[PDB]
Amino acid sequence: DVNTLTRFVMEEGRKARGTGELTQLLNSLCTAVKAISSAVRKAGIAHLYGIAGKLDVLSNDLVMNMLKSSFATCVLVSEEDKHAIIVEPEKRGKYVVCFDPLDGSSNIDCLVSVGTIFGIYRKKSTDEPSEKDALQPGRNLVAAGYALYGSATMLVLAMDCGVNCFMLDPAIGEFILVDKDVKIKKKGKIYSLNEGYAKDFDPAVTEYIQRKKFPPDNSAPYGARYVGSMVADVHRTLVYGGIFLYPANKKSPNGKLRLLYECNPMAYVMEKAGGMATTGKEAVLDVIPTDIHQRAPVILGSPDDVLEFLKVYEKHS
Amino acid sequence: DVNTLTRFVMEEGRKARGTGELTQLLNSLCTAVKAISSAVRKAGIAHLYGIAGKLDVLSNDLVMNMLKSSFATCVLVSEEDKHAIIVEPEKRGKYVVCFDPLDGSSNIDCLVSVGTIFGIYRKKSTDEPSEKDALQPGRNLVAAGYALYGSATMLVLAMDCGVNCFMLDPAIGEFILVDKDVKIKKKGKIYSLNEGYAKDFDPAVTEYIQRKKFPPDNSAPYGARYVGSMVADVHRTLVYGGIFLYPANKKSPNGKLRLLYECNPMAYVMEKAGGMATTGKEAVLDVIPTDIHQRAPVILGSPDDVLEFLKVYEKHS
Amino acid sequence: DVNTLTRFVMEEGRKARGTGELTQLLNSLCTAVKAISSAVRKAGIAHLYGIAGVKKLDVLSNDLVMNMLKSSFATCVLVSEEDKHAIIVEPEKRGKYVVCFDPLDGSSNIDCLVSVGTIFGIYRKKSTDEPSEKDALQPGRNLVAAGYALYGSATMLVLAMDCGVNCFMLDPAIGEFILVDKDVKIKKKGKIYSLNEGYAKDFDPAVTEYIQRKKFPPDNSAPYGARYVGSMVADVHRTLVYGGIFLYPANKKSPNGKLRLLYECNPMAYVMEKAGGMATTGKEAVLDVIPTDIHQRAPVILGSPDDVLEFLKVYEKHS
Amino acid sequence: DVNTLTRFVMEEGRKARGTGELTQLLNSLCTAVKAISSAVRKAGIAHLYGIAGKLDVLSNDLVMNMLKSSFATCVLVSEEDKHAIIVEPEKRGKYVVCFDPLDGSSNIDCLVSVGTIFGIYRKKSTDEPSEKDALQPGRNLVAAGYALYGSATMLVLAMDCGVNCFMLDPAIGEFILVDKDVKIKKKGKIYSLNEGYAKDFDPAVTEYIQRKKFPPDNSAPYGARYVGSMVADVHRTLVYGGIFLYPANKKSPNGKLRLLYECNPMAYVMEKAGGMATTGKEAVLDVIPTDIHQRAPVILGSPDDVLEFLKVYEKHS
Ligand SMILES: COc1ccc(S(=O)(=O)NC(=O)Nc2ncc(Br)s2)cc1CC(C)C
Ligand SMILES: COc1ccc(S(=O)(=O)NC(=O)Nc2ncc(Br)s2)cc1CC(C)C
Ligand SMILES: COc1ccc(S(=O)(=O)NC(=O)Nc2ncc(Br)s2)cc1CC(C)C
Ligand SMILES: COc1ccc(S(=O)(=O)NC(=O)Nc2ncc(Br)s2)cc1CC(C)C
């Protein structure tokens, strides 16, 4: 029996007998994704080239306006905005949203995969809303996931029950449930990182990657893939299994990916799909942030693979 | 002044006072590309999931039927077919087409970019048409290029005058010229190959890669990218500069990519854009093929970079 | 601030503190409307013509609404112009609402690309019996909501409920219905009459006179304009936008008219009244007719209040 | 075998061994139709209503810009512009185009069918082009037709060979040939006119209309339809047979429809499909215009039905 994103959310929202504020947020966000996807596929570009005589910025304004107008949000953190946005009081609701509205948008001249990442928190403090409400640890996530604008446009939603994937049919503007309660492979055969920083790698990364190119039990070497747009690399990891690594180098001693709206949402999706996500020292979701644009090193993916790396990490102290 | 692929080809076709058979072929191919794009973006997928109670095969049939019915082709070589297809005589025309109808479609489960690669030859003899007509070297190409099914749909077309890029506007089904006469950077900063099989690297490849991660002059190391879908990795190389390598080792002395419908059209686009493409021993376009599904190693991209690789390659011989 | 149909329905659903079953109904219906529009615009017809070497549009439309409603968990009885007997939803998918619909009205003339539409009416199941066709035999007064999708130059969804009539434009780049006309109200008097004057030979005498009074005013004012698309959804919606009167009246060859009460006349009458208009059979208001069979017909004259009145004067003038 | 509008125009154009200037015209015109369809279906209206915080005028600018840039036009007459536009010398070509880019658009608030009507004449003089070049009779048409934006978008193209109908598949932006070499019914069962102006009907019109409601041979009365958009009413007449009448009354002794870009193109389709079009006094195509915006009464459709009208017209003088 067929199921849609809006219909899955409403069925789940009634089963839990909640108020609907979260559904309204999800519906508003889903609508922005459909608009962003329309622009990413360059629909309507002919008028820009004078047929009748800022893609990351447009994405940002789409998500800002659609979330502000859902009456369901109070603090919004975006990669595009230096400070958190504090929703004006008349439109204020109970939720905090952190998002990268167009991840990979720097490599968009090459039509690389791009994506939207989002994380949803229930405001915890009872103070007047401020940036501090967006500083919760990943454990506190109520919902998170991403839209991948690839060969097709897909939405991955992870909440308490698990992870579900919806394929956007652009013919009707509706998201079709195509993968119910997805689970990552226990062990993959692919490693994913930018090996250009090999000169700046921590030795454990060097040992684990060396173990993938020349396996010690003389098994088959892993394949390498690295798109360089995080949604694309993480999503492949989810669908095919394996391990993704953006560790700390010298240009980024605290890692390069942003914790609030890049690492934690992927870490939540991974964990709710049976995978693991670590900074090296601790699980990603346990990190308590202090700044909205702070970075974190991240290694995530299949349980056996992330565990194997963790053994290598302890070996080097 | 606004310009489309259909309008552009007619302009070049009149300026050259040709018969129109080539323009008819390109228009048919472009229409097949738009039809492929709609399915890759999963338009109408709602009906496959029972809303009222094969993707590379469909691609192959679209190009085949659109080429056969253009009245401009006589022999068609496709990745999907063991033997070359001979157009029935009533629909027979003066051109030979080699294509991969959907390259990278094996990784399409994760929505990575996919593409169609095509190369066009003029039939040289007046014999009865046979596979012998497909075995020209890349030097003989009249037009060649690819469609990238990425974040957007782009058609890159390389003919004698040079390389031009068209963006598909899906609201109107027209390819909008957005890049006239592209030329690749003289030297790039990205290396692109599957470093997972380092255990089996030919030694020159090993050394070339180490020099990219660890420059002896302590200049900047290159970044690594590898989508693992050929159209995507090559198009990025064209847009950003750099080098793509699917090289020969000893386990596969001829590489893995197919010469007729993968290596030659990319070599043509690269060379027509100021780039280089070698197998290590010779330019890709100089190879005289003996079997339509034969393999060839390929290293392509910026001239300074292909030259540097070849400098390392002669060293290990 | 921008507004979409899905967002508008949820707002009203919370404001009224309902269970959500009705919102789930309209959203599923909205989705079926979007899919119909995709097919009506012949998206993918190139594959139908062997571009790589399935049903008829009104059959497929019916399947879409049926399947989208059955799976909404908000319906128990479905009556369709396409199905002779009312459908009783299986118990697991069973809900508390009864739906009458015309899935593709006017589809007979679609070979000429005339406007076509989906019409729907939504009732609450009143009795506590096991659900049966009888639950569909409620009068139009009992409607919870009603409206129609018009697949014309654009695809517009008109939703009429107690609070009023709202119009949504389908933006196909994103597949969302955009609130574009809030709280619509029909003109008190129009300048258009709409009916099939080819069958004048069989006109009820009041109609013959009323049309003469619109073409040759006794008060020697300006004549009314004539328009008749012949697709009910198109003609009624124009009357809503420009004012005037629409007539599919009763003659002697068809003393009860030809249009169907449950899923054509009642939903159009419901929209008309919630927008300040009128809909009468001549003898009684359309919404007051108590149906005895799900496919029974009824004459309908609707449009601006003043114009339906002038007709009623002439109708009662003819005893 | 599948065939598109562009491929069909190229085939007939090659068979005639022409320069391509007409094919270039039609391709550019077809692309503007595709753009108007997208806007008329209100694609992208969500941004018009502030999702991130003029339709006939847009229609004209599209056709104007698309025709000027085809390098195939010299004089353009449009319903929207009081004087003919004279294409600038660098973009000049050998064809004259009269069009209504968005006919019936005054009724677009109710989502009535609208259309684009066009007629194409060869430049008459070799002098400096001027309005006199558009003042040719309908007999001189090289090609003419219309795009109907109704429940679907269809292109009706009438040239010397006949009339062919193309359906726009908006999923791929190509017009698909769906009716070859169409011919109108010899006699229909529908008449189509505005009986609201009955007060001023020419007596012949009154008598012919009475003859349709009350047949002397006690056959079936004709059915009545009148959408009020000429393209919609004319296309129905072509597809189902019957008669469309916008005749001369006392309120308008020369009719109200415009002869160059409404009556002349529709009469041509009618004649090329086996139908007829008269003003009452003469064939529409034989009227030589004196001013580009002159009006003409028109009665068109199936031949036997127009003949029955013409008998009554000759009877009444
Ligand atoms: C466990 O999942 C949930 C729990 C609560 C909520 S909620 O607080 O928004 N409640 C509601 O929406 N109630 C409703 N009433 C009428 C309607 Br129709 S929906 C939503 C979800 C779904 C999300 C996770 C996709
Ligand atoms: C140098 O470029 C070309 C040379 C020949 C050809 S052709 O053989 O197809 N001739 C024609 O098309 N003639 C026409 N006359 C009128 C029309 Br309208 S088209 C096409 C191209 C363009 C391609 C390569 C982009
Ligand atoms: C006044 O109109 C209504 C009355 C009841 C209903 S309802 O029974 O469906 N309740 C709900 O939907 N509750 C919800 N809870 C959470 C969410 Br989020 S929506 C809906 C409407 C809206 C109109 C447009 C149909
Ligand atoms: C009567 O049919 C025609 C007569 C002349 C012309 S034309 O002057 O445009 N010639 C050409 O286009 N030649 C070409 N050369 C290369 C190509 Br590829 S097409 C076109 C048509 C067909 C149209 C009207 C559908």
Supply the CATH number for residue D219's domain. 3.40.190.80
CB burial of residue C90 (10 Å; 0-12, 13-18, 19+): exposed
Sign (positive or negative) of CA dihedral A198, A203, A205, A208? positive
DSSP state of C112: G
Which residues have C-beta within 8 Å of that of residue B100, sequence separation ≥ 6?
A: B78, B79, B115, B116, B117, B118, B258, B261, B262
Please state the atom number of ligand 3 nearest to the C-alpha of residue C144: 25
Sign (positive or negative) of CA dihedral C294, C295, C299, C305? positive
Task: Tell me how crowded residue A254 is: count the other CB atoms within 10 A of its CB.
Answer: 12
Q: Could you give the CA distance from residue C247 to residue C236 in angstroms, rounded to a whole number?
A: 9
C203-211 long-range contacts (CB < 8 A, ≥24 apart) are C203/C251, C204/C249, C204/C250, C204/C251, C204/C252, C204/C318, C205/C318, C206/C311, C206/C314, C206/C315, C206/C317, C206/C318, C207/C247, C207/C249, C207/C251, C209/C314, C209/C317, C209/C318, C210/C310, C210/C311, C210/C314, C210/C315
Contact B64, B85 (CB under 8 A): yes
CATH of residue D14's domain is: 3.30.540.10
Binding-site residue set of C for AMP: 9, 19-23, 96-97
Bridge-based pairing state of the strands C116-124 and C143-151: antiparallel
Q: How many CB pairs under 8 A join A and D?
A: 34
If DSSP codes are grouped into helix, strand and coil, which group holds residue A91?
helix
Residue B149 sits in the same domain as residue B191:
no
Of D182, D170, D154, nearest in space to C112 by CA: D154
Query: With left for phi above 0 and alpha for psi between -120 and 50, is residue A75 left, alpha or beta?
Result: beta
Contact A126, A83 (CB under 8 A): no
Residue B107 sits in the same domain as residue B156:
yes
Q: Which chains touch D (3 or more CB pairs under 8 A)?
A: A, B, C
The pair of three-digit structure tokens given for residue D220, joined into one six-digit string = 């079936």
Domain of residue A222: give its range.
182-316
CA of A11 to the centre of ligand 1 (A): 7
Q: Could you give the CA distance from residue C240 to residue D150 in angstroms, rounded to a whole number?
A: 19
Residue of C nearest to B36 (CA): C52
Does the Cβ of C23 fall within 6 Å of ligand 3?
yes
Q: Which of C150, C183, C216 is the last residue of a domain?
A: C183
Q: Could you give the CA distance from residue A144 to residue C189 in angstroms, rounded to a whole number?
A: 54
Please state the atom number of ligand 2 nearest to the C-alpha of residue B159: 24
SS3 content of chain D, % helix, strand, coil (to 5): 40, 25, 35
Cα of D128 to nearest chain B Cα, Å? 24
Residue C36 sits at the vertex; the CA angle it makes with C31 and C41, to the nearest 5 degrees, is: 130
Q: Which of C183, C211, C242 is the last residue of a domain?
A: C183
Contact D200, D264 (CB under 8 A): no
Residue B185 sits at the vertex; the CA angle it makes with B180 and B191, to the nearest 5 degrees, is: 125
Residue C162 sits in the same domain as residue C196:
no
Residues of D in contact with C179 (CB under 8 A): 49
Residue B112 sits in the same domain as residue B224:
no
Q: Could you give the CA distance from residue D122 to residue B222 in angstroms, rounded to a whole number?
A: 61
Q: Give the CB-side neighbour count of residue C298, counting CA atoms within 13 A.
A: 33
Look at chain D and report how many structural domains it folds into.
2
Instruction: Say yes or no for a CB contact (<8 Å) between B52 and C64.
Output: yes
CA nearest ligand 2 atom 8, residue: B18
Q: How far is CA A95 from the centre of its chain?
A: 18
Torsions phi, psi of D108, nearest 5?
Answer: -80, -10
If DSSP codes are grouped into helix, strand and coil, which group holds residue A10?
helix
Q: Could you give the CA distance from residue A279 to residue A289 in angstroms, rounded to a whole number?
A: 13
> Tokens 């070849």, residue?
B310
If DSSP codes are grouped into helix, strand and coil, which group holds residue C264?
helix
Sign (positive or negative) of CA dihedral C193, C195, C201, C204? negative
Of B128, B288, B147, B140, nearest in space to B231 by CA: B147
CA of B110 to the centre of ligand 1 (A): 29
Terminal-residue alpha carbon distance, chain C: 53
Residue B119 sits in the same domain as residue B198:
no
Q: Could you give the CA distance from residue A31 to residue A23 in angstroms, rounded to a whole number?
A: 12
Residue C152 sits in the same domain as residue C210:
no
Torsions phi, psi of D13, nearest 5?
Answer: -70, -35
Torsions phi, psi of A3, nearest 5?
Answer: -145, 145
Binding-site residue set of C: 9, 19-23, 81, 96-97, 102, 104-107, 196, 199, 227-228, 232, 248, 258, 260, 264
If DSSP codes are grouped into helix, strand and coil, which group holds residue D236?
helix
Residue C164 sits in the same domain as residue C194:
no
Residue C273's alpha-carbon distances to B198, B306, C167, C276, C287, in angstroms, are: 76, 76, 15, 5, 9
Q: Could you give the CA distance from residue C160 to residue D150 in angstroms, rounded to a whole number?
A: 25
The pair of three-digit structure tokens given for residue C178, joined into one six-digit string = 């955009």
Contact A130, A146 (CB under 8 A): no
Residues of A in contact with B177 (CB under 8 A): 49
Residues in chain C: 319
Residue B110 sits in the same domain as residue B122:
yes
Strand-pairing partners, residue B145, are: B118, B157
Reported resolution, Å:
2.8
Of B199, B235, B280, B239, nearest in space to B103 by CA: B235
CA of D18 to the centre of ligand 4 (A): 5
If DSSP codes are grouped into helix, strand and coil, which group holds residue D300?
strand
If DSSP codes are grouped into helix, strand and coil, which group holds residue A202?
coil
Q: Which of C135, C166, C183 is the last residue of a domain?
A: C183
Q: Could you give the CA distance from residue B179 to residue B172 in angstroms, rounded to a whole number?
A: 19
Residue D9 sits in the same domain as residue D155:
yes
CA of C67 to the centre of ligand 2 (A): 51
Contact D178, D291 (CB under 8 A): no
CA nearest ligand 3 atom 3, residue: C13
Does the Cβ of C23 fall within 6 Å of ligand 1?
yes
Residue B95 sits in the same domain as residue B171:
yes
Torsions phi, psi of D214, nearest 5?
Answer: -130, 80
Q: Could you give the CA distance from residue A115 to residue A261 in angstroms, rounded to a whole number?
A: 12
Q: Could you give the CA distance from residue B283 to residue B277 in angstroms, rounded to a whole number?
A: 6
Q: Could you give the CA distance from residue D85 to residue D64 in angstroms, rounded to a whole number?
A: 9
Residues of D in contact with C156 (CB under 8 A): 111
Residue B87 sits in the same domain as residue B191:
no
> Tokens 């007719």, residue?
C289
DSSP state of D226: B
Residue B198 sits in the same domain as residue B305:
yes
C208-215 long-range contacts (CB < 8 A, ≥24 apart) are C209/C314, C209/C317, C209/C318, C210/C310, C210/C311, C210/C314, C210/C315, C213/C310, C213/C314, C214/D196, C215/D195, C215/D196, C215/D198, C215/D199
Terminal-residue alpha carbon distance, chain D: 53
